[PDB]
CSV table of N, CA, C and O and ligand atoms in Angstrom, one decimal:
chain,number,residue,atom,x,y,z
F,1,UNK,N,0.8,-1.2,0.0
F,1,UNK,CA,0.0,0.0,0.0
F,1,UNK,C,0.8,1.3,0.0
F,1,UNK,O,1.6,1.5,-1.0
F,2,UNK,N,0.8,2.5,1.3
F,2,UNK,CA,1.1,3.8,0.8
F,2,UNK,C,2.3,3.3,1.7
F,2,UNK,O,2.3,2.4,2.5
F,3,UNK,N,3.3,4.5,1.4
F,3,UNK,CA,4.5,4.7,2.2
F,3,UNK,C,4.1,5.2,3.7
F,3,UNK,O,2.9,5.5,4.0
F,4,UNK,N,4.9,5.1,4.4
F,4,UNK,CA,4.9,5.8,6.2
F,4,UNK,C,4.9,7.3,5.8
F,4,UNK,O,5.8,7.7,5.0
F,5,UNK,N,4.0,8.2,6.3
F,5,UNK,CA,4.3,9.8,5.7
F,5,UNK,C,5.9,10.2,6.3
F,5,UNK,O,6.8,10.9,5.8
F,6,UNK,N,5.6,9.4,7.8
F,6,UNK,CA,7.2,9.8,8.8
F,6,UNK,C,8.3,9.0,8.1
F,6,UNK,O,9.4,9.6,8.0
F,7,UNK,N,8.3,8.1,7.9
F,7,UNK,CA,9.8,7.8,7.1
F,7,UNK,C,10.0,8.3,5.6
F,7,UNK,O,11.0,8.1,4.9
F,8,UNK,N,8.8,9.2,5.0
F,8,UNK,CA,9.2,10.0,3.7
F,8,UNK,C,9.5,11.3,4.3
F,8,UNK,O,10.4,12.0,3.8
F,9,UNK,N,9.0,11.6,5.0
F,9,UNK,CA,9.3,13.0,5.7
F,9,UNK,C,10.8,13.0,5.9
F,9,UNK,O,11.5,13.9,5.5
F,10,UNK,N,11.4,11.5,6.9
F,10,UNK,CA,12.5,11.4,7.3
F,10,UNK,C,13.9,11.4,6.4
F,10,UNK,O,15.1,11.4,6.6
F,11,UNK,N,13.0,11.4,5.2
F,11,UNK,CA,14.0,11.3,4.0
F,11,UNK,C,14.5,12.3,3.4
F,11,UNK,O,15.7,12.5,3.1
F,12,UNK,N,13.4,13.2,3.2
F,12,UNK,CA,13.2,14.2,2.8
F,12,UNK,C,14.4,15.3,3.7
F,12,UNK,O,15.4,15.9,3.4
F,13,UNK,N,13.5,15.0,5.1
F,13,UNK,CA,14.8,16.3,5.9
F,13,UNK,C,16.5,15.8,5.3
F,13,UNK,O,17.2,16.7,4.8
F,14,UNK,N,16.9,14.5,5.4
F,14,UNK,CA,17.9,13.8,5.3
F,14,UNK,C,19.0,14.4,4.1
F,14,UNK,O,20.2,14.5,4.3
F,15,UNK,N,18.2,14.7,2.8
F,15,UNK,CA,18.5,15.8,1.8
F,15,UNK,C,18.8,17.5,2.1
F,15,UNK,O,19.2,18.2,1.2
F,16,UNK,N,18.5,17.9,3.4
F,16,UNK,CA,18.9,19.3,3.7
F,16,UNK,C,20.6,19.0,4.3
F,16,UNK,O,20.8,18.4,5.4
F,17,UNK,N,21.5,19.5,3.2
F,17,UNK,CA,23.0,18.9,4.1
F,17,UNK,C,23.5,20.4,3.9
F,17,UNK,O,23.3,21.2,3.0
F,18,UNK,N,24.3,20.4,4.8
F,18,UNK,CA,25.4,21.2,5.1
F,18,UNK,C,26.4,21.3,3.7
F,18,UNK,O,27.0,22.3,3.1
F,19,UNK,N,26.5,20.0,3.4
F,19,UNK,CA,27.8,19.9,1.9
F,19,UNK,C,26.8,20.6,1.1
F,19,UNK,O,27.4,20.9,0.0
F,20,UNK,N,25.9,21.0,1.1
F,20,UNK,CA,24.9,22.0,0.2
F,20,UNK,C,24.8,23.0,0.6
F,20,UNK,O,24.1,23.6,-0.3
F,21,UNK,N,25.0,23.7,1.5
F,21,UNK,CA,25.1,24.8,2.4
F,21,UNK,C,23.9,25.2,2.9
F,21,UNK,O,23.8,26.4,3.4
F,22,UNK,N,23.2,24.6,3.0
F,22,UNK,CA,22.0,24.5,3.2
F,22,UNK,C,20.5,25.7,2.0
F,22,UNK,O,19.5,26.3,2.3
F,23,UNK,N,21.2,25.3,1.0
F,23,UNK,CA,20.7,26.3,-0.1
F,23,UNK,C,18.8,25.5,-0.4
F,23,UNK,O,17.8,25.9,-1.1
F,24,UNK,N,18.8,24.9,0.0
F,24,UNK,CA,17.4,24.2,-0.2
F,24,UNK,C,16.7,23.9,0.8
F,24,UNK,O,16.0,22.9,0.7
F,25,UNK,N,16.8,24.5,2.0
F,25,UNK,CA,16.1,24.0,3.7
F,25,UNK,C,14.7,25.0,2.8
F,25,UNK,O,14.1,24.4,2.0
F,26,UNK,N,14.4,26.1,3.0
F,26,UNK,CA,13.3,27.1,3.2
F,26,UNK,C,13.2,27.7,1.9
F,26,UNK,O,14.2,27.7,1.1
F,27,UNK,N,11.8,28.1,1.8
F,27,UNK,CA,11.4,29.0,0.3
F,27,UNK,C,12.3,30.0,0.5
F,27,UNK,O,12.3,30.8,1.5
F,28,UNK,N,13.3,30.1,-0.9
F,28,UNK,CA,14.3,31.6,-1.4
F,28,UNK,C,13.1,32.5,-0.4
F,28,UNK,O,13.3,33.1,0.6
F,29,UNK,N,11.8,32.5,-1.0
F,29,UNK,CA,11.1,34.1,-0.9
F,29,UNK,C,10.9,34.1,0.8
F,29,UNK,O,10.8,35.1,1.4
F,30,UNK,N,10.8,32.9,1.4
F,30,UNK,CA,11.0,33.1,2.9
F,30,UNK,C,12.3,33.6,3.8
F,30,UNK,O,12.4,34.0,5.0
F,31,UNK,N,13.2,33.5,2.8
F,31,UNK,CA,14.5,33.9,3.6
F,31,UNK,C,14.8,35.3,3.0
F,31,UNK,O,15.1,36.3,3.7
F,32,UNK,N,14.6,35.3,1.7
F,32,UNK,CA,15.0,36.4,0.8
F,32,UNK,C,14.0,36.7,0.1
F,32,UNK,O,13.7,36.2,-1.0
F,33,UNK,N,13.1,37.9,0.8
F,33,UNK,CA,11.6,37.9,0.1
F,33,UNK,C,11.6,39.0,-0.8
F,33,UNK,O,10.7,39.2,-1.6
F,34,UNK,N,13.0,40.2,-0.8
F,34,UNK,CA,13.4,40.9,-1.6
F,34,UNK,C,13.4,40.3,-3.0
F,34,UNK,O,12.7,41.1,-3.6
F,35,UNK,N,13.8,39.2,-3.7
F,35,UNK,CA,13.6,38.6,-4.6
F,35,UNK,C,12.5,38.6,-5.3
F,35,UNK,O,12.5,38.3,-6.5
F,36,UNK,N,11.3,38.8,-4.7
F,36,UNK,CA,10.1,38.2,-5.3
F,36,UNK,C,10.0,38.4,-6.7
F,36,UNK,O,10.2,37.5,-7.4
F,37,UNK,N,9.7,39.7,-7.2
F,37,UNK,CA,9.6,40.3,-8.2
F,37,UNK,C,10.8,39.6,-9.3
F,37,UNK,O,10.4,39.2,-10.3
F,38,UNK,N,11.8,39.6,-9.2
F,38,UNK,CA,12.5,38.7,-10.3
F,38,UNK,C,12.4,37.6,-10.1
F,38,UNK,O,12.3,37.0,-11.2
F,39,UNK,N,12.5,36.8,-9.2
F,39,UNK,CA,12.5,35.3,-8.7
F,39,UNK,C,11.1,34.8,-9.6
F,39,UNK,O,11.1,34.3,-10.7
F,40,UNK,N,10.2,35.2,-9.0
F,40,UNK,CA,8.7,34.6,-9.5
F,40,UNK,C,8.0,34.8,-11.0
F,40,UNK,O,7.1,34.4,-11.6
F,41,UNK,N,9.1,35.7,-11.3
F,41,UNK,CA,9.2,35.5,-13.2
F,41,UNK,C,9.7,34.0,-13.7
F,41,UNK,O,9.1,33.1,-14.1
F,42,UNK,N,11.2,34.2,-13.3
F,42,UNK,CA,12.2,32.8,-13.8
F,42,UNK,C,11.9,31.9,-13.2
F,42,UNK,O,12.2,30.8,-13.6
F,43,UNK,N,10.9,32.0,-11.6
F,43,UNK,CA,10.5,30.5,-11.6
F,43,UNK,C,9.3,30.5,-11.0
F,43,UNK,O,9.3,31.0,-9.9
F,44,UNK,N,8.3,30.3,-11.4
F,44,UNK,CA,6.8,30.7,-11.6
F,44,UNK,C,6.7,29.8,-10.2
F,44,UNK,O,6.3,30.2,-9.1
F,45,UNK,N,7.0,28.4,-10.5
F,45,UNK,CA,6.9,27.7,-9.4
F,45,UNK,C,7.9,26.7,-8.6
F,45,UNK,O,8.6,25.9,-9.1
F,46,UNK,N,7.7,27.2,-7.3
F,46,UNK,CA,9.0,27.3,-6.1
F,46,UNK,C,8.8,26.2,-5.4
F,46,UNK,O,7.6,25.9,-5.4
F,47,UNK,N,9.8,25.2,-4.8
F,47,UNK,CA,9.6,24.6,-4.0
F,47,UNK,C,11.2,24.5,-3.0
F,47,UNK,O,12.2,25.0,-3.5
F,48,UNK,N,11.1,23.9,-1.9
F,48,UNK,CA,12.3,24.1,-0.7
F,48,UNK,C,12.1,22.7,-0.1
F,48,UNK,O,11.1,22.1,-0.6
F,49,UNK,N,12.7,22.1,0.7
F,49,UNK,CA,13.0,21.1,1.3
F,49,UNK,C,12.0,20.7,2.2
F,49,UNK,O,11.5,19.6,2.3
F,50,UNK,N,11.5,22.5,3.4
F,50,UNK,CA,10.7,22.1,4.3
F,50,UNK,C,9.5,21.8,3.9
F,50,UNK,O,8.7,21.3,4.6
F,51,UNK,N,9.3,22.1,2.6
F,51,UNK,CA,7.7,22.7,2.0
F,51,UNK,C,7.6,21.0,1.8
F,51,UNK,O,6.7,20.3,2.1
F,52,UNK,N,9.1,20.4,0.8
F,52,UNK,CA,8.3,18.9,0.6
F,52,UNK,C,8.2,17.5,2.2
F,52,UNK,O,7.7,16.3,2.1
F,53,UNK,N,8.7,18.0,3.3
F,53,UNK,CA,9.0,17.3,4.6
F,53,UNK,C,7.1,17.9,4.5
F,53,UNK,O,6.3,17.1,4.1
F,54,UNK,N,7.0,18.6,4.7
F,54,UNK,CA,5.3,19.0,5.3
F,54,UNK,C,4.4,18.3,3.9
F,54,UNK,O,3.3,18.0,4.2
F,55,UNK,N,4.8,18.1,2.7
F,55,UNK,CA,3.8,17.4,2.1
F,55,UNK,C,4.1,16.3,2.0
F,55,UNK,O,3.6,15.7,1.1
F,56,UNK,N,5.1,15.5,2.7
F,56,UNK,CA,5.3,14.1,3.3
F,56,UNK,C,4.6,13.4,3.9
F,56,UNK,O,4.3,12.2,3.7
F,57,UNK,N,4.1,14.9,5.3
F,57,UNK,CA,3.5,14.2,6.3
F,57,UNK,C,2.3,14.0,6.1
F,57,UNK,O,1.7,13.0,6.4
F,58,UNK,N,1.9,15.2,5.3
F,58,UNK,CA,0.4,14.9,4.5
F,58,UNK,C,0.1,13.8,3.8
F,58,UNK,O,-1.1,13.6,3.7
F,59,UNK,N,1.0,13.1,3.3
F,59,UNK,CA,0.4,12.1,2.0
F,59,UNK,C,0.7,12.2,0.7
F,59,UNK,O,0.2,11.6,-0.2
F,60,UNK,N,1.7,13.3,0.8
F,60,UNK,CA,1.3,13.6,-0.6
F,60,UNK,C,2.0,12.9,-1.6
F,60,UNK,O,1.8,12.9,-2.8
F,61,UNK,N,3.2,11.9,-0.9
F,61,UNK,CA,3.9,11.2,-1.5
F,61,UNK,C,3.4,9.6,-1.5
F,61,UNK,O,3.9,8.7,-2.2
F,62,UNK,N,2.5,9.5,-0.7
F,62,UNK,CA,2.6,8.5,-0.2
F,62,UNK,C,1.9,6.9,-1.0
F,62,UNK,O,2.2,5.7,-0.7
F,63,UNK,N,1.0,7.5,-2.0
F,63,UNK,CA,0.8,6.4,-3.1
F,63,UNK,C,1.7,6.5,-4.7
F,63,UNK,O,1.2,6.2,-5.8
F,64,UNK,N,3.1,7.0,-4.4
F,64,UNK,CA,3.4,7.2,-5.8
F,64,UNK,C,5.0,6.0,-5.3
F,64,UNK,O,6.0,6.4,-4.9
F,65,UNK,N,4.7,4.6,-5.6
F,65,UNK,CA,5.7,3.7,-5.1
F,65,UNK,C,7.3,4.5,-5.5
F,65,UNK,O,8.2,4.9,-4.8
F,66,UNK,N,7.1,4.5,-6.8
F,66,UNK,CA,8.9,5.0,-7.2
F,66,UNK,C,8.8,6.2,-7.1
F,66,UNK,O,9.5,6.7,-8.1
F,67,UNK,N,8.2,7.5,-6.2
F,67,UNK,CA,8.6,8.6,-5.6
F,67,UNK,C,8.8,9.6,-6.5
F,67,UNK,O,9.5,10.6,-6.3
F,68,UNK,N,7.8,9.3,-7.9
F,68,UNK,CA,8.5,10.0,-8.6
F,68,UNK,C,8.2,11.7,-8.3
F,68,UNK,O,8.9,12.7,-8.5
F,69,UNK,N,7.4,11.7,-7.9
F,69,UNK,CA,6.5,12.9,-7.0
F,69,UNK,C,7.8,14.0,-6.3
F,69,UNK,O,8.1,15.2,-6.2
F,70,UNK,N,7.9,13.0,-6.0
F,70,UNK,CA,9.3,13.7,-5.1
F,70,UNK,C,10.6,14.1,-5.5
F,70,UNK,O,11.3,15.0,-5.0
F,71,UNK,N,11.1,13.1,-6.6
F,71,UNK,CA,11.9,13.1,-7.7
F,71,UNK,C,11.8,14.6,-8.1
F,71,UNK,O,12.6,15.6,-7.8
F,72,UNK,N,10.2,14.5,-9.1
F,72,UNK,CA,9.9,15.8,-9.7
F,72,UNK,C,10.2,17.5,-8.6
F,72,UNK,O,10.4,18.6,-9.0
F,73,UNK,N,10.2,17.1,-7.3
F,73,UNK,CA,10.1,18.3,-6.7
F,73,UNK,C,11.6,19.1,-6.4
F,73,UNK,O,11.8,20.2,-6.2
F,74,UNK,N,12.6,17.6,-6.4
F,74,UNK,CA,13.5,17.7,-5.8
F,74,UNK,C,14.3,18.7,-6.9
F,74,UNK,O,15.1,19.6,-6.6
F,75,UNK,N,13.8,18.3,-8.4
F,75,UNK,CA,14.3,18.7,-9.7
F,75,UNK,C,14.1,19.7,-9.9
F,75,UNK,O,15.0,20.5,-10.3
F,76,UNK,N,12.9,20.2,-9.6
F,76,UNK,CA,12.2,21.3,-9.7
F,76,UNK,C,13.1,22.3,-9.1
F,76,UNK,O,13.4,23.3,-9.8
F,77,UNK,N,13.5,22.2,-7.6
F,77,UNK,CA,14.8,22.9,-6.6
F,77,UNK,C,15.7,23.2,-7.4
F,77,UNK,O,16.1,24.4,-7.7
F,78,UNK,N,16.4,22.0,-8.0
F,78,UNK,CA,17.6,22.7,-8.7
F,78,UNK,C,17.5,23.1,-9.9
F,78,UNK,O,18.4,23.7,-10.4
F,79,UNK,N,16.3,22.8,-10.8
F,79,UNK,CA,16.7,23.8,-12.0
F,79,UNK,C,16.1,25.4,-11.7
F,79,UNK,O,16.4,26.4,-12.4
F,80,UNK,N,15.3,25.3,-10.8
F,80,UNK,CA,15.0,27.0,-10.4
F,80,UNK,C,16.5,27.6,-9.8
F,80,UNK,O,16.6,28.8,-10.0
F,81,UNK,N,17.7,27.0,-9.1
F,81,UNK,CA,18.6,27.5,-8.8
F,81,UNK,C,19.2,28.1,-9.6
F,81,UNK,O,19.7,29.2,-9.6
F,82,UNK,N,19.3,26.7,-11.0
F,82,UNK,CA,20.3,26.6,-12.0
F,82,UNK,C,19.5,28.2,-12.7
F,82,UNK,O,20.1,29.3,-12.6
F,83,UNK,N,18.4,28.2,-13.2
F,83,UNK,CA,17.6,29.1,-13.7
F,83,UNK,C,18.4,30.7,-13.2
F,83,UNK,O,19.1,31.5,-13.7
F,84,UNK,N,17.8,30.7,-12.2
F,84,UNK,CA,18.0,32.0,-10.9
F,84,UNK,C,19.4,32.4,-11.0
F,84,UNK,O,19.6,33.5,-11.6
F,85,UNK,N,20.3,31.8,-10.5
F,85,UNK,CA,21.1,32.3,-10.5
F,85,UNK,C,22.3,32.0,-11.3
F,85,UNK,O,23.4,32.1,-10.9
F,86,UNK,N,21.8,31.4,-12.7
F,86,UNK,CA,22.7,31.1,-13.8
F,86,UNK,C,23.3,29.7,-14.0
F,86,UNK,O,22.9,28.8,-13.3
F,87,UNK,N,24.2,29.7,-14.9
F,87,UNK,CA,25.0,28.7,-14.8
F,87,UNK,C,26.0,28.5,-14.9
F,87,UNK,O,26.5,27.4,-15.0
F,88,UNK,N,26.6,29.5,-14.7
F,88,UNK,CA,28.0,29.7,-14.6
F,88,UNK,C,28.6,29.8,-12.8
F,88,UNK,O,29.8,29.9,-12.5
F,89,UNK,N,27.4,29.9,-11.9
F,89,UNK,CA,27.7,30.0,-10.7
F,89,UNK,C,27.5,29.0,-9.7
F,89,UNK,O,26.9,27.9,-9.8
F,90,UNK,N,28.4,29.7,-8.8
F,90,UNK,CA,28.6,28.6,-7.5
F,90,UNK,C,26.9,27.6,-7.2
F,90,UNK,O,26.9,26.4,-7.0
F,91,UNK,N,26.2,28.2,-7.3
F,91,UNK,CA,25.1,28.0,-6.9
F,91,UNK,C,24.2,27.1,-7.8
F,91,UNK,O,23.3,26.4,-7.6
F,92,UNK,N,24.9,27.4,-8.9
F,92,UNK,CA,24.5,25.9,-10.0
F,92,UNK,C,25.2,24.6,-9.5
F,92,UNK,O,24.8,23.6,-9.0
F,93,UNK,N,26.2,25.0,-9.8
F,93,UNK,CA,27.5,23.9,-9.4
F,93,UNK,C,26.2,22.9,-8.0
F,93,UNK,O,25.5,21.9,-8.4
F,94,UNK,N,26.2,23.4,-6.6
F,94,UNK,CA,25.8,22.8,-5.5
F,94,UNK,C,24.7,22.0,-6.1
F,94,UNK,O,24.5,20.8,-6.0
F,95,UNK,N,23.7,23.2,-7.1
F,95,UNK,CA,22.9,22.1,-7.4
F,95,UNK,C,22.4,20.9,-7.8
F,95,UNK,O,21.6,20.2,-7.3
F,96,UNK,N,23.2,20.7,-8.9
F,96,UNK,CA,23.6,19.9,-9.5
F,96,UNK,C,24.3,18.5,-8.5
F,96,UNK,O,23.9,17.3,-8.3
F,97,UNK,N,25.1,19.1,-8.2
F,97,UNK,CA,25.6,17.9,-6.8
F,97,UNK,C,24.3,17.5,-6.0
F,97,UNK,O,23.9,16.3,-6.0
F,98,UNK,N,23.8,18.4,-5.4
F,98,UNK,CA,22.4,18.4,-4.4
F,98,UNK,C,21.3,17.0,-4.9
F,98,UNK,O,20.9,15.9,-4.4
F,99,UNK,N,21.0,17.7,-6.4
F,99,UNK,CA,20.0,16.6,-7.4
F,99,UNK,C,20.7,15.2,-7.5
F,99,UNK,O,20.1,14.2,-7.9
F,100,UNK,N,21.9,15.1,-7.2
F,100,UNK,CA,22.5,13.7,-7.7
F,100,UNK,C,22.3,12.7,-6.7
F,100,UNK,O,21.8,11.6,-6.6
F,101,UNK,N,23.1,13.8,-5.5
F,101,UNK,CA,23.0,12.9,-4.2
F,101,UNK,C,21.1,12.4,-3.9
F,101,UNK,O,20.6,11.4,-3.5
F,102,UNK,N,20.4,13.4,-4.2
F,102,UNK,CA,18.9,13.5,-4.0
F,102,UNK,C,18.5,12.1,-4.2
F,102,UNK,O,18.2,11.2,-3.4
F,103,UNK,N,18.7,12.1,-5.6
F,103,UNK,CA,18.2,11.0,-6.3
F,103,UNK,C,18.9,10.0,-5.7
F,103,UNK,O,18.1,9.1,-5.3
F,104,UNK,N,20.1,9.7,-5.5
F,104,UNK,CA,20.8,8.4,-5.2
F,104,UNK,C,20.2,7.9,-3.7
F,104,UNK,O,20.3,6.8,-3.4
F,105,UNK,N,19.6,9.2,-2.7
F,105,UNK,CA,18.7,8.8,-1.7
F,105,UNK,C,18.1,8.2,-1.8
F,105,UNK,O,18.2,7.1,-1.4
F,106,UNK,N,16.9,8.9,-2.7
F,106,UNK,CA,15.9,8.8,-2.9
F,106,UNK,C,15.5,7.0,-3.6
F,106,UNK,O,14.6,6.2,-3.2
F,107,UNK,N,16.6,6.9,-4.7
F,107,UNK,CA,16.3,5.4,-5.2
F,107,UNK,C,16.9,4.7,-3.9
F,107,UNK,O,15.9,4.2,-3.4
F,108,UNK,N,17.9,4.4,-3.3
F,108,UNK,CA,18.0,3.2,-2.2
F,108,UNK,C,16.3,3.3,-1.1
F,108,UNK,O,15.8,2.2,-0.7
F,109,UNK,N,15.7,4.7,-0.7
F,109,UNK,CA,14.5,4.3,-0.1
F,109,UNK,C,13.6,4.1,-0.7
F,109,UNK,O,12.7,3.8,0.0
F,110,UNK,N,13.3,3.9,-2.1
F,110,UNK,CA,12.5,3.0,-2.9
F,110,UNK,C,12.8,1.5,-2.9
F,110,UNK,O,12.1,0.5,-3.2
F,111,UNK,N,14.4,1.5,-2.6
F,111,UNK,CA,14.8,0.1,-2.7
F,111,UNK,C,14.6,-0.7,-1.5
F,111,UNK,O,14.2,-1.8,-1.6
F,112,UNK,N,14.8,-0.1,-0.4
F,112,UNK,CA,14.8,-0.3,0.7
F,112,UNK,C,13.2,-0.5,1.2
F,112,UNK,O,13.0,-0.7,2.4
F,113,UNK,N,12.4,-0.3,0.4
F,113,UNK,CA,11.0,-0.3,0.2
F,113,UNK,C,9.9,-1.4,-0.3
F,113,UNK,O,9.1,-2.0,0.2
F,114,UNK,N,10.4,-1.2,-1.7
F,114,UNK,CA,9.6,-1.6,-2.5
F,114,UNK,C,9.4,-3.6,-2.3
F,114,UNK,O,8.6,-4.2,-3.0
I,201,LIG,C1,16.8,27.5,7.6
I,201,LIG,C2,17.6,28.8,7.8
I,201,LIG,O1,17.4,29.5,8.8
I,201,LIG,N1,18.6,29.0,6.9
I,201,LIG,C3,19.1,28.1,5.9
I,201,LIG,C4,19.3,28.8,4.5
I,201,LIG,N2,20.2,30.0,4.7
I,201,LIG,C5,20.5,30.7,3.4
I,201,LIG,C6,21.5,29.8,2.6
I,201,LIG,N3,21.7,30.5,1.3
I,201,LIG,C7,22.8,31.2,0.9
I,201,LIG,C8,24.0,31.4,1.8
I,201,LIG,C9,25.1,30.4,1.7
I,201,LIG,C10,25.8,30.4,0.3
I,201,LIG,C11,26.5,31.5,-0.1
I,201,LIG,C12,27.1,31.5,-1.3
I,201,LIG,C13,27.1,30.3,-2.2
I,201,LIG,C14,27.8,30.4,-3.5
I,201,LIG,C15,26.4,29.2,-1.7
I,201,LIG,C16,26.3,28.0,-2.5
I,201,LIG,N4,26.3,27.1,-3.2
I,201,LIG,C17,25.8,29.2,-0.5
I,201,LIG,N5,22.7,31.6,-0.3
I,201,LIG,C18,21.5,31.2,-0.8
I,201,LIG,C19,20.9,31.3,-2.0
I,201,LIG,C20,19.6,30.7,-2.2
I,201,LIG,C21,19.0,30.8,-3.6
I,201,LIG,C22,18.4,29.7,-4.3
I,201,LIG,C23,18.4,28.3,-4.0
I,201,LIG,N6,17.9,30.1,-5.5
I,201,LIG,O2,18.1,31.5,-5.5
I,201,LIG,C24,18.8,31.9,-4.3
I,201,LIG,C25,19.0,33.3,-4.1
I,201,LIG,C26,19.0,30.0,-1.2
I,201,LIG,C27,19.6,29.9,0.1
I,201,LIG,C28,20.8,30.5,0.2
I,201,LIG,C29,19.6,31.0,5.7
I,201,LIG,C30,19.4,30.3,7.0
């Protein structure tokens, strides 16, 4: 049946690391709401780490077996980064790292699962 919301939630936080500097814990516009106006052009639609731990706990992951739900959101994070603040910058670079390690979580708890 569905996943544990608390062990997708637990996964989820598990992805906010320090070796990322913590560039994906909270919505950019919550930390940095100065942004809005250019941010919410280049990325119409935002997502952050805490935002997918709280639709963890909800359910929102919780009948999609291979996660792809979460996949999609995680991706979503880093090409708004890559988007935002280019690609030539530090802040691409993390992301790219960030989505790899993501994913390589993300598939052992489907493995470790399914
Ligand atoms: C939960 C909480 O209280 N937090 C956690 C989050 N930090 C902010 C972290 N951060 C810092 C500061 C650290 C830093 C500086 C310079 C570089 C090149 C790197 C890298 N690579 C990292 N630049 C940030 C930039 C963004 C960001 C995104 C995503 N898309 O557009 C922007 C702008 C988000 C968080 C950011 C505030 C305190």
């Amino acid at each position: 049946g569905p996943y544990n919301e608390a062990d997708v939630a637990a996964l989820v936080r598990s992805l906010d690391r320090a070796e990322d500097h913590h560039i994906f814990a909270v919505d950019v516009l919550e930390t940095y709401p100065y942004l809005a106006e250019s941010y919410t052009k280049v990325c119409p639609r935002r997502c952050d780490l805490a935002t997918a731990a709280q639709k963890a706990l909800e359910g929102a992951y919780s009948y999609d077996l291979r996660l792809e739900g979460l996949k999609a959101d995680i991706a979503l994070m880093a090409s708004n980064c890559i988007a935002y603040n280019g690609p030539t910058s530090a802040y691409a670079e993390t992301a790219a790292k960030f989505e790899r390690h993501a994913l390589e979580q993300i598939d052992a708890f489907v493995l470790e699962h399914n």
